[PDB]
Amino acid sequence: PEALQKWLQLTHEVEVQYYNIKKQNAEKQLMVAKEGAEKIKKKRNTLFGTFHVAHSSSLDDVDHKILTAKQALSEATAALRERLHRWQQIEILTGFQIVN
């Protein structure tokens, strides 16, 4: 039991590190999307003036990268919930302390 427990603890540590990366990348993806829209709003300001840009706000993110990024963050939140439940069930079935 001792050996399998250590293999499982290593597997869990690996998954947590992958998850942290997934979350960090989703956060960066949202930042990048917002920066990109900020940049386009600035360029559209130079091309058409601020009033015009105010009455065509949807054009600063034509491909809706911001909303897509928000869905990405939602999935990260979902990933966390799935992982927590899965390892908890694994701990219960093995009788091993794997996570904490």
Added chain:
Amino acid sequence: PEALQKWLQLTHEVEVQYYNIKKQNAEKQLMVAKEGAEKIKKKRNTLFGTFHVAHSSSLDDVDHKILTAKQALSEATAALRERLHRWQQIEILTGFQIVNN
């Protein structure tokens, strides 16, 4: 133990998917870096002439994004090895067939 096997199978799928995304992301980083340098080089050729560029080739990637990207991608090999060995051991210890293509 039928339930545990399913939980472990799922865990393995999740890990393999993470691994592939990370590898794909590093591959994308390399592609992007090469692209960036190839673009700068073309621009420099027309601005300064081919003779000049042929004597200042390192200026196409001043921050070495290409070498940096290559270095990170190279780790994929060790990451694969570590994963295969760990799960092989888990399979042996549990007596379960867990791994996937």
